Amino acid sequence: GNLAGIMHRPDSEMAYVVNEQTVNIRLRTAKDDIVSVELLAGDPYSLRSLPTDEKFYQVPKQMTKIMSDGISDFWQVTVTEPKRRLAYAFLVTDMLGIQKIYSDKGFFKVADADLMDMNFYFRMPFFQTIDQYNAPEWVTDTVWYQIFPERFANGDVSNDPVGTKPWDSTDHPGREDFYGGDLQGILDHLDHLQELGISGIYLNPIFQAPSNHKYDTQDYMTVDPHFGDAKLFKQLVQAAHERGIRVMLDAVFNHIGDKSVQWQDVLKNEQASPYADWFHIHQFPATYTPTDNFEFAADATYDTFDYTPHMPKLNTSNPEVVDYLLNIATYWVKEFDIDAWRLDVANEIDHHFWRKFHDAMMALKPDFYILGQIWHTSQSWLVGDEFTAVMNYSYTGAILQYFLENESADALVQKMSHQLMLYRDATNRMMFNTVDSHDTPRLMTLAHEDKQLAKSILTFTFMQPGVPSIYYGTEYGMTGENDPDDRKPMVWQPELQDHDLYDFMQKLVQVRRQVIAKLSDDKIIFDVIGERQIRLTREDNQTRIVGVFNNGTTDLTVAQPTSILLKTNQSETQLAPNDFMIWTEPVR
Amino acid sequence: GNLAGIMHRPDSEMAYVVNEQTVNIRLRTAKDDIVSVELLAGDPYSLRSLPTDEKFYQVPKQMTKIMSDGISDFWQVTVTEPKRRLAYAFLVTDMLGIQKIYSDKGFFKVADADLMDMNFYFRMPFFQTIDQYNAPEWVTDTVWYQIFPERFANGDVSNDPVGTKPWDSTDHPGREDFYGGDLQGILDHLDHLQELGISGIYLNPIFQAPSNHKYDTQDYMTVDPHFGDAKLFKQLVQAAHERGIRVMLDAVFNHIGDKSVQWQDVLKNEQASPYADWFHIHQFPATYTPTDNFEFAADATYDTFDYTPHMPKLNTSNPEVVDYLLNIATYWVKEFDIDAWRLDVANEIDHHFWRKFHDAMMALKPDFYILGQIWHTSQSWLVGDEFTAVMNYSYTGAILQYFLENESADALVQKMSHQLMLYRDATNRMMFNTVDSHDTPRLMTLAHEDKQLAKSILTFTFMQPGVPSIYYGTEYGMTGENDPDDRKPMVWQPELQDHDLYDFMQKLVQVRRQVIAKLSDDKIIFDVIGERQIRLTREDNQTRIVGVFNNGTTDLTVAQPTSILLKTNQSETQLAPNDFMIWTEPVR
Ligand SMILES: C[C@H]1O[C@H](O[C@H]2[C@H](O)[C@@H](O)[C@@H](O[C@H]3[C@H](O)[C@@H](O)[C@@H](O)O[C@@H]3CO)O[C@@H]2CO)[C@H](O)[C@@H](O)[C@@H]1N[C@H]1C=C(CO)[C@@H](O)[C@H](O)[C@H]1O
């Protein structure tokens, strides 16, 4: 066999604790190279210490091939052990029938394996629930709605910035425009969100900051006055909670804005500033050479977000900075009862900080949701001691590439399978899935205003293990290129809203919350049934939910389902190009 | 190529920070499948943000094949980046000349790679020295000596246990014997240790406990009275330090002895004990059915070390237990200035505890040495936030198997290479190498009293990257099977000591401390030069230290070295079976 393609990494996503007495174990092999895998596993000490003749390796446990990413196959088994100590090894058999044992000591013929020595085996030494990954149950039942607050609704003209423009969803906004959106506007349209079936609101930054996006924080302890005040934000969280809607805020801890008191003190006092070591300043005075692009300087003497001199990086290794940020993070949860933090540029802040942050948040709220914004693979933040999940950009990015750019269905399934095998099973169910955002082009623009394609993308994404999110205005078909064009004033004029798409989104949210989310410890199955034709299945012990997506150029016939949940063709058997059909059936 | 055998895991031992501006990156490939690897790497933001035409991917960096374990090849490069942000991907070319790019997004033809998108790449997002692994420099210059204190020297008959036996190194000790060894005996023989050239003492447990080995702790805050008292232990540490000898104590935190006040309170008060939740008790009252073996019960109602009812496991997830143990760990360092902790059964205690332990010890002593006793691979404890190193059982175990059991030299080199590539480079230089201990058979018994073979094993081990240790009495050729037979009273009678071996050990310790340890950022090279013939090289920029080991059945001729450091044959060119020769030469 292909020995170089076989790997087990102990104490990782390949070997982890699920509950007090139960672990999940995975093995990677080369694709279709290994025909079968059995696990030899038991209490390490039982070998030497128990007087019985029985030994744990005499009774293998069958592992199951669960996924393939086109390069590797992934195998998994669940193991229960009352002594809460586990030694294990793998019995692998290849296509020609060559069998070997694979352990911490390498590859062996079965006859040459020292199976009586506990130190031969891989080890899960004691099952430690304090170290395990935990997923908050309520996230399972959530569909999120992302609000960029300057652009959702102006509920109060009296707090509008100078130069506020008339509200017009057909505008192409500039980088520095203001339209007057605020917290009162969100409060005014909570009925719309409840009627859509939303159960969680994700807000972009709302703290005091000079810009329209407010990622250049001036004061983390104050609601921006053009958005509202403390009383109004408390009123908003309570009204959301009254409707069964959770609230997630944006924490921008990697950098601070240059109009903050801290940075301004650095500019005044140089290295004698009490805040000098809160930043990353290579040479004093802190300076840069301005360019014609507000967001770019080539030679700042301090580290920044990207190359923008207005966003000096915070030194989160400094204990004064750790204390400052933890106090901010605690304040908004303890005083306003928010339910989750979305962490801006989370990957550029150290693990030491994130572990302290995790500890603080879980002590306040055991079911808190910590969501990191990271575009690349994020295994090291998803062990169970830092974040709950990350933005699932790679996963939704593959979905978009398939629907928009003519990839093979095999390629998409390979990519999604790869993603799932990066992380623990429970982690995958917490990942945050959005097909667009305040940073990227809008769905309807990506789809070149093909509404059928947009519906296909949304439905496919809403069937995935992670939790879905709708960017404000998706439900009415709003268009937009990249930032700032993806930040148009919300469309509230009915003559400009796509009512068909709104009705469809209501139905899809209901399939997600009432059908998919109520499955019990379901599995997902990806089947490539034809050229650009995919069957997705979610199934538990009683119920199977099947979706078929025809994204080729021919018609596809399927058996008439007894119980159709959602479809785009009027036919109950025919799927034209870009049609899909979702149905439910009992498992026999 | 063999794509299933290529892997890079970001934020691991394959991608880690060395200093403020410098990282080390590794790639795994299938053995001899990939002919060359180049790294494409630079600041992720420079792609989009800098106005220049130059892009970081246009200038590859060559990676070097550093090791092979017989299954995989390992490649490495060091990268410097002033912006302290790194995006990277790998250019891999196989034996047929097929080249592909390998990134976080998978494998691509170079023409199909989105090299302008920072999110295509693997990422080291910001170089965080607070998260990095740090090695204490002083360990580099150490040779350790392990003392099992009951058996090293009786310096005070007046503290002897009842039933103490006459001191006799030819005895075969029983499990429950006492010979009266104590702290005063160690103090009395510090001259012997200095003369041998030892610079660190590792003590087995010395705290109050009823047994001869004292792993069944009764009181962690008191020196066992048969060994000494606080004043005497302080005197011992000061005299050791005066001689340039560091001190490491044994921390037995996984379990406590059943005669402790805590456990006895559980036996008296059942679940109403203030200490009930300090343990892992499944059913009250805490009980077991005794057997004829003191160390075994089949049915204890509480978790234990192994299956011994006298060693109840501590619940280190309980914050009262965390506080109790951290106070013990702090007390011995702060009040007695010890230099290191050896952690008994360290793998069975949770990471959450070990991180708090690490933080406490480093705050007391930035150069503290934390050594975990773990027999299996230990990557998850060696990231930089928990232990400094582990006992290197797998590494010395492979060495022993080669010298004693006729393996191929290829097999040994494969195993050592595997070990080294599990861990960060600096970690490998902190690993603790001993060929025997209070738990295993003695070297001279393993060697069937073949002194030449014992010398070969010791010399080969002392040339390795990790720090070496001598178990008390190895220097005089003491024999012994497994525990308790490996715990004989130290041989102080000159007529019973092997003086030749003592002289040899002095010379070998001097080669280690004065030659090998004074190399500057050296590399190690393993060459298989014949059947059971190995050339080991340690070389820096000026100096090369070469050792040749002939462990076949024929004579081996080598070129006469100009500067021989150590050899066993009288010839300067001939190596008979089991001879070795060590020399030094300048690098040209
Ligand atoms: C300067 C920039 O600030 C704001 O951008 C933030 C994003 O909205 C956040 O989602 C987050 O995204 C960054 C990722 O964390 C990071 O890993 C990398 O992928 O880049 C992302 C940003 O592209 O962090 C950002 C900083 O807090 C604001 O929303 C955005 O409008 C701001 N301007 C940039 C975007 C446009 C329009 O101004 C470009 O033309 C500018 O050159 C950029 O300055």
Ligand SMILES: C[C@H]1O[C@H](O[C@H]2[C@H](O)[C@@H](O)[C@@H](O[C@H]3[C@H](O)[C@@H](O)[C@@H](O)O[C@@H]3CO)O[C@@H]2CO)[C@H](O)[C@@H](O)[C@@H]1N[C@H]1C=C(CO)[C@@H](O)[C@H](O)[C@H]1O
């Ligand atoms: C009961 C046992 O206590 C003492 O043993 C300790 C060892 O000396 C330590 O080095 C450490 O070794 C254990 C490893 O951490 C663990 O991962 C596994 O490899 O087993 C190792 C022990 O084999 O931890 C031990 C517990 O603190 C003491 O030194 C030893 O004499 C004691 N007895 C055992 C050894 C012999 C002779 O008594 C056997 O015949 C007994 O059945 C055992 O009870």
Ligand SMILES: [Ca+2]
């Ligand atoms: Ca307003």
Ligand SMILES: [Ca+2]
């Ligand atoms: Ca004594």
